[PDB]
Amino acid sequence: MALLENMHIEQLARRLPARVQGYPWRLAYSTLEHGTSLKTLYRKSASLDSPVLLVIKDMDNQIFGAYATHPFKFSDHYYGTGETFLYTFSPHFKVFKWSGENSYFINGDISSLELGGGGGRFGLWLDADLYHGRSNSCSTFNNDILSKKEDFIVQDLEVWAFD
Structure with a gap:
């Protein structure tokens, strides 16, 4: 609603896996509304029992993020399944799947x-303030850089769930 326009919702809805198709989108975390900190993201994502959609709008107004099969949580380990993918609308909408x-x-x-992950690199990286972000090409998704440069600054960030 606030970061996405109808253009973004339709192109994203067409690439979501079948298990979330037709599930209404619930806003679970928002930098605009809840307090900008990875800690706060964890608290809102706690007691989420569904896959989530990460929406990032950087300081260049470019929109990208990820669909995750599991809520974001502090983890000793890597988690999630292969339905997870990355996406960007810059310079055009493109999805990088498993x-x-x-x-x-x-x-x-x-x-x-x-x-x-894989060999040190990563697809998407955010710091504890949800401020400095980073995006490289990684083996998990074979994505190109989601943002303009490798380094980006988070302007707004939303996490949507499918309750």
Whole structure:
């Protein structure tokens, strides 16, 4: 609603897996509304029992993020399944799905949150303030850089669930 226009919702809805098709979208976490901190993200994502949609709008107004099969949580380990993918609308809408090379889907930490893994790199990286973000090409999704540069700044960030 606030970060996405009808253009974004339709192109995203067409690439969501079958198990969430026709499930209404519930806003679970929002930087605009809840307090900008990875800690707060964890608290709102706690007691979520569904896959989530991560929506990032950076300081260049470009929109990208991820669909995750499980709520974001602090984890000793990588978790999630292969239905997880990354997406960007810059320079055009493109979805980077599981490549089958590894299973390093989601990794929650106290200092950072990252999706994708393998040999050090990652697909998406956010710091504890949900401020400095980073995006590289990773083996989990074989994505290109979701943002303009490798480094980006989070302007607004939303997490949507499918209760």
